[PDB]
UniProtKB/Swiss-Prot annotation:
Keywords: ADP-ribosylation, Disulfide bond, Host Golgi apparatus, Phosphoprotein, Ribonucleoprotein, RNA-binding, Transcription, Transcription regulation, Viral nucleoprotein, Virion
Species name: Avian infectious bronchitis virus (strain Beaudette CK)
Residues of the full protein shown: 29 to 160 of 409
Compositionally biased region (Basic residues): 44-58
Organism domain of life: Viruses
Family of the protein in this entry: Belongs to the gammacoronavirus nucleocapsid protein family.
Quaternary state and interactors: Homooligomer. Both monomeric and oligomeric forms interact with RNA. Interacts with protein M. Interacts with NSP3; this interaction serves to tether the genome to the newly translated replicase-transcriptase complex at a very early stage of infection.
Listed name of the protein: Nucleoprotein
Length: 134
């Protein structure tokens, strides 16, 4: 079965190794995006276990975490701040975490992922992400 629909608007951040704790952010941890009202500058990072083909089956690869605006994505059911394993909540100064964007999710058939930029900091050194030009 192939899951389809709620892909993140942004590229993933990726743990450098196995058994890595959730990302911590310098600054807000909300990805750069000029096309969002400041009131709606809030969301969550969600962990996705990754795998790679193996001889014995498929082998673990370090986790990826994907960003979703609050009330969208695999954890659309959650309110900002709700406790859930594999969910880290983020919000910028000026954000009203009750507000809901219509950003929805990305259709990979129509739109490529946005490059990730954090002008106010970014995730800790446990994490990395691929270079994509703006």
């Amino acid at each position: 079965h192939m899951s389809s629909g709620n892909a993140s608007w942004f590229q993933a951040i990726k743990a450098k190794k196995l058994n890595t704790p959730p990302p911590k952010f310098e600054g807000s941890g909300v990805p750069d995006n000029e096309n969002i009202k400041p009131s709606q500058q809030h969301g969550y990072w969600r962990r996705q276990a990754r795998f790679k083909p193996g001889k014995g089956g498929r082998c673990p690869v370090p986790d990826a975490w994907y960003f979703y605006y609050t009330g969208t994505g695999p954890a659309a059911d959650l309110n900002w701040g709700d406790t859930q394993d594999g969910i880290v909540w983020v919000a910028a100064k000026g954000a009203d975490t009750k507000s809901r964007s219509n950003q929805g999710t990305r259709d990979p058939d129509k739109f490529d992922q946005y490059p990730l930029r954090f002008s106010d900091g970014g995730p800790d050194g446990n994490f990395r992400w691929d270079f994509i030009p703006l």
